[PDB]
Amino acid sequence: VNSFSGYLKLTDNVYIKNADIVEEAKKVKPTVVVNAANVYLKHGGGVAGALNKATNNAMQVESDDYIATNGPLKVGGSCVLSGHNLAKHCLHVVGPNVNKGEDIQLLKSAYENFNQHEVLLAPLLSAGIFGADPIHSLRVCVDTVRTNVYLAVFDKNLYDKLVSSFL
Ligand X SMILES: Cc1nc(Cn2cnc(N)c3ncnc2-3)cs1
How would you list the strands of the sheet with 148-153, edge to edge? 8-9, 14-18, 148-153, 119-122, 32-36, 89-93, 78-82
Beta carbon nearer to ligand X, 65 or 100: 100
Q: Out of 128, 141, 142, 162, name the contact with ligand X by CB under 6 A.
A: 128
Q: Is 121 in the site for ligand X (CB under 6 A)?
A: no
Residue 114 DSSP code: G
Q: Rounded to whole angstroms, how far apart are CA atoms 46 and 53? A: 11
Residue 165 has phi, psi (to 5 degrees) of -100, 0
Q: Out of 55, 120, 123, 145, name the contact with ligand X by CB under 6 A.
A: 123
Task: Give how many residues touch ligand X by CB under 6 A.
Answer: 16
Beta carbon nearer to ligand X, 79 or 127: 127
- According to DSSP, the β-strands at 8-9 and 14-18 are antiparallel
Q: Which residue is nearest to ligand X (CB)?
A: 128
- Map the footprint of ligand X across residues 23-42, applying CB under 6 A: 36
* 8 Å CB contact between 144 and 151: no
Q: How far is the CB of 14 from ligand X (least distance, A)?
A: 15
Q: Rounded to whole angstroms, how far apart are CA atoms 79 and 34? A: 10
Q: Is 59 in the site for ligand X (CB under 6 A)?
A: no
Q: Out of 14, 16, 21, 145, name the contact with ligand X by CB under 6 A.
A: 21
Residues near ligand X (CB under 6 A): 20-22, 36, 46-47, 50, 123-124, 127-130, 152-154
